Target: Neopullulanase 1
Amino acid sequence: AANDNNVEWNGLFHDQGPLFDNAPEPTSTQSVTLKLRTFKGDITSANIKYWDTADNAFHWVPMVWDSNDPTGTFDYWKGTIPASPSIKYYRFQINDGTSTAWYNGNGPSSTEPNADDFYIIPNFKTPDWLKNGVMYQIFPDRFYNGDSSNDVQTGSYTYNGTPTEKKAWGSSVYADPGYDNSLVFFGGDLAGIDQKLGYIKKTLGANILYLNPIFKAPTNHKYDTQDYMAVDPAFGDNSTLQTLINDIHSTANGPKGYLILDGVFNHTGDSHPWFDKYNNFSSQGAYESQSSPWYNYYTFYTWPDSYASFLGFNSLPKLNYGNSGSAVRGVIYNNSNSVAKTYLNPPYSVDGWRLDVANEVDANGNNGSDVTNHQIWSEFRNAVKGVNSNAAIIGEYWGNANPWTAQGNQWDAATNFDGFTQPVSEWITGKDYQNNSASISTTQFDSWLRGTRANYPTNVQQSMMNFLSNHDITRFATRSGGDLWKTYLALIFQMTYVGTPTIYYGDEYGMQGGADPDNRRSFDWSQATPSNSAVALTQKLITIRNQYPALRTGSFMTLITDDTNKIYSYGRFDNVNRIAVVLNNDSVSHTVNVPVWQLSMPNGSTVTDKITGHSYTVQNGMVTVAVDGHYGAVLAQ
Ligand SMILES: [Ca+2]
Ligand SMILES: [Ca+2]
Ligand SMILES: [Ca+2]
Model:
């Protein structure tokens, strides 16, 4: 490069990883020093342009040359945004004589962008264990039956007229005639999770457990809460939960573990005593009496039979959050004995909440995504973080969750349907996550990923819950048509991408399943061994991620987007390590010249492919690696 009236886009880089930003989670008193990479000698001037929410105006910080990289290929220019409490957004203007380029969260642009600026959110922290962890999601009825004495039997009880049905382990999940899919039980429980912690924490190596709902409720899914303050008897009692938590937290059985519970706060079940539609309690619920102590916890259009409910399901009456200081806000999060605080305080001390349909939570029967919804989650954050600043808050939302994350006042992160599950599904399987036809190329995949990362502050990106499948979509292995190699590829991407890798129980061995309820099959402990190739790969990949901070909190740089050969390569890198991931999404093998010079891997240095164990030497800026179809290499130094 030279001063030639031309900014060379391929040399440009910035993100908020360690090489480029000295304070990615600054306080009010920490200034933010930013570095912008260019090719050596490429430019004449560069400027940081930042919007300051303190004065609703743009501010200009000229950059200065700072240094070269060790290979002598690049310059770094630097400038500092001053310390203050205010949220700020920034982009770069980059000039080489008569050539100008702009650069922000969406990368380079010839014209000045008006969206996707980088974020500075003073005093906003997401928990570092969440950024650095690997999560395992368990739907508790279907994982392991550690105690047969608590099992729901066929006809143990009835709910809204229908008796319960028990199934043998391994059998089909669908309800036989006279029964209901929501009242089918296999007997999985908290004792079972506890007894299989070795598998989770050592055989795989995941350090975060996320459970679907575990509180008293009549269904197998337990989103229709009857008692938030009791573990459902089928799963155990509150002492069983305490034991499970102690064993998760223990460092004597593997790494220190964390537990995230499913917080179902938009609605209760119709059998909750506050509502009590079937008269299961001597108290008078809102359905039973307009003088009920809890009458104003719900919203009636025509009392008693027409009320606000989740997706119009009469079994899920919607909670009325009212105004600040309301009794409902009290019982859910403000009170010390609230649902949220009870489990965060001793003697439970759980590590976070996954917020079910969190966008819907509101007052007056409204459907959220509004001022009141956001106010509620701001209060919720204060409540949660006041008890435990390292308790995680992850909201369920299927789109761009910017409105609940990018002011640093609400969630730490969200369920990454839009930025992970969907684009991974369409790239690898040619299906959307509901198993309908929707395919994207590699260039499209890369673009989709970048634009969705740019929706979020960096700490939030790093804390996103990144799952291949979950309890509300079709299984990845069904979308893949049973091709185990498509799972291998998906796992390698998952374990080296930005955000918390989250394994939906059984995805690590290739479990199949269509729509709900078929995405909740029981777990096979024989198929759950290193003899299954996907399980062995998962263990290896978790070990790799845990070895390299660059994979969890490093920069992300696209290296190759090859639509001909279906090769995607990207780098993860920080001050210590440089890692080039090379993915082959074709059905045939390809030999790839990986441009590791882009990560400043020096000529003559070596990398190891952590997938196979083979070593390679860097020559003329390149590493040449052969990659099987639907597979990948993780070239680390
Ligand atoms: Ca130039
Ligand atoms: Ca059981
Ligand atoms: Ca009653």
Observations:
- The pocket of calcium ion (ligand 2) is lined by residues 145, 147-148, 150-151, 187, 189 (CB under 6 Å).
- The two ends are 27 Å apart (CA to CA).
- The domain at 548-637 is CATH 2.60.40.1180 (Immunoglobulin-like).
- The first helix runs from residue 128 to 132.
